[PDB]
Every structure is written in C-alpha cells, then in structure tokens.
Structure 1
C-alpha cells in the first residue's frame, strides 16, 4: 500500500483505489496502473521534473529504503496478477530490487522529488509507475 500526497491530490495504484477515491476521482489510467483522487488537506510531497535513472524506493516487505538504478519509462509486458491479466503496461520503469505484491504504492524518489510508485515485480525485479510527466499535479 501507499500513496503520493501532492497539493490537493492523492496518487495511488489504480488496483488499490478505495470507494472514496472513485467517488472523488480526478483521473485514472488502467494501462499505467494509476488513479488520482482529490483531497481536502494539502499534501507535502513534491514531484520530480527530471530524467534521473538513479533513486531510492521504499520496500514495505523489508521495512527498508533501497538505492536503485532504473530504466526510462517504457511499454513493458507485465505478467498476470490478482489485479490484471497479462498485458502491456505503459510509462513503467524496471529496477533490480526486492518486491512482493503488497509493496505496491511505495515511493521511488530522486534528488528532485517523487518519481513514481511501486506497481509490478517478482524474481528480484521491481517496476515503478512514473508520474514525472503528469505536470498538472503541480497546479490547481
């Protein structure tokens, strides 16, 4: 589990969105595994606007933050899970790092701010849904 709280937005994995998220929906995209809902309180996270390929992510199944090198956002075939059949996921970045299904939502961050959230993984890989191209998260 986990979310990004920026401005009056809450960014979560679409497959973990709650009824309150769907009832306060701003934007969702199944191919990216992302959903954004509106919040009453202002959040403290800031989004990175960069092309970093090194950062740190939080892994709840280890209660630890790990440094990682990650790929650029791309269209990758992701195996079937409890939440989606096997399909192509867009804006996804891969790294070598531990992950389990419930690690989805952990933040990946670089020197500039939040880069994305854990979305996929297995066998010593972890994939992150990028949010750096969603410029509208910084306004309204």
Structure 2
C-alpha cells in the first residue's frame, strides 16, 4: 500500500483504489495501473521532472529503503492477476530488487523528488509506475 499526495491530488495504484478514490476520480489509466483522486487537504510531495535512472525506493516487505538503477518508462508484458488479464503495462520502469504484492504503492525517489510508485514485481525484479510525465499534477 501507499500513495503520493501533491496539491489537491492523491495518486495510487489503480488496482488498490478505494470507493472514495473512485467517487472523487480525476483520472485513471488501466494500462498504467494508475488512479488519481481529489483531496480536501493540501499535499506537499514534490514530483521529479527529469530523466534520472537511479533513485531509492521504499520496500514494505523488508521495512527498508533500497538504492536502485531503473529502466526508462516503457511497455512491458505483465502476467495475469485477479486485477488484470495478461497485458502490456505502459510507462513502467524495472529495477533489480526485492518486491512482494503488498509492496505496491511504495515510493521511488531521486534527488529531484517523487519518480513513481511500485506496481509490479517478482523473480528479483521490481517495477515502478512512472508519474514524471503527469505535468498537470502541479497545476
């Protein structure tokens, strides 16, 4: 679990969105596993606007932060789950690192701010949904 709070927005994994998130929906994209809902309180996270390929992510299954090198956002095949059939997930970045399903929502950060959130994993890899291209999150 986990979310990004920036301005009057809350960014979460679409497969983990709540009834309140869907009732206050701003935007959602199944192909990215992202959902953004509106909030009544101000968010203070800073979104990174960069092409960093190194950063640190929070891994709840280990209660630890890990430094990682990660790939540029791209279309990557993702095995079927109870949330989606087998498909290509877009704007996804992979890194070599530990992740378990409950790890979704952990933030990936670089020196410039929030890069994305954990969205996929397995076999010693971790995948992050990028949020750096969502320029509207800041206005």
> Which TM-score tier does this pair reach, normalised by the shorter chain?
over 0.9
Q: Secondary structure at the match of 2:20?
A: helix
1:45 Cα offset (Å): 0.7
Q: Secondary structure at the match of 1:52?
A: coil
1:113 Cα offset (Å): 0.2
C-alpha distance after superposition, 1:65-97 (max 9, x if no partner): 000000000000011123111100000000000
> C-alpha separation between the residues in 1 aligned to 2:79 and 2:94?
14
> C-alpha separation between the residues in 2 aligned to 1:81 and 1:68?
26
The alignment covers a number of residue pairs equal to 139
> C-alpha separation between the residues in 1 aligned to 2:117 and 2:130?
7
Q: Which runs of 5+ in 1 are unaligned?
A: none
> C-alpha separation between the residues in 1 aligned to 2:118 and 2:22?
20
C-alpha distance after superposition, 1:31-86 (max 9, x if no partner): 00000000000012110000000000000000000000000000000111231111
- The within-5 A match list for 1:1-140 is 1-138=1-138, 140=139
What TM-score results when the alignment is normalised by the length of structure 2? 0.98
C-alpha distance after superposition, 1:84-114 (max 9, x if no partner): 1110000000000000001000000000000
> What is the RMSD computed on CA atoms of the aligned residues?
0.6
Q: Secondary structure at the match of 2:102?
A: helix
> C-alpha separation between the residues in 2 aligned to 1:120 and 1:85?
14
